[PDB]
Each structure stands twice: as C-alpha cells, then as structure tokens.
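Lecture 7 notes: from sequence to structure.
We start with the chain below.
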Amino acid sequence: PKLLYCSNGGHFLRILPDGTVDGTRDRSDQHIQLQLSAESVGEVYIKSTETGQYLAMDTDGLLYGSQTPNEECLFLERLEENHYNTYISKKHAEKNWFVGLKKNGSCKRGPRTHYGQKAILFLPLPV
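Predicted structure tokens for the same chain:
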C-alpha cells in the first residue's frame, strides 16, 4: 500500500482509470495508492489499489495502465545510492527504458529516459 514520489517535479505516480499514467501532487487523489508486488527478487508488478490496473510500458516506451497483467507489466527494481528507486521495463530491459515523469508531471517516454535524470528516481512511501 505505497505511494511512489518522483524526485523530479515532486509528483506521486498515478494511474488514471483510462490507462493514462502521469503525475499528481494531490495526496488525496485516489489513483496514487499503489501496490508493489514482487514476482522474483527485484522484479515487481506495480498495481493500483483503486482500479487494479497494472503499470506497463508499451513498444514506444509510453507508460499506460494495463487492465490485466502480462510481460509488459514487469519492472526491475533497483535501490539507488540515496533511498530512492529506479524501475526498468523488463520487456525492454536491453533498451534501458525507465519509468519516469517530466517536471510538469507528465509521462517521460522510455526512449527519452536515461540514468542520472531525476525523472527516474522514485521514493516508495507507505500510505
């Protein structure tokens, strides 16, 4: 029962019911309560506790909400040097595509992500 805070512009990661991932700063928002559930070690699904949608990155690197689970919904967790976390699309691990948000709280597509950005750091917060 966790919130994922993005260091970049200070948004909590948010899966809107229509599949559009983005960020909000509103703590009472329903769609930010997430559940991180480990398949293997350092291999998680990221799910909304409010819609049951799964976070997923498609072929273009666009993050969306997946209504059912699958290959695209798995992400590689890495704890970073501070207390923050990065998350790679397992299905696109080679392409080194992270979950990330821009500074205005919008999805920063995989292609345009990379290491050393503040877009890709997230701080899990127990709700």
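Points to note: The chain has one domain: 1-127. The longest strand covers residues 43-48.
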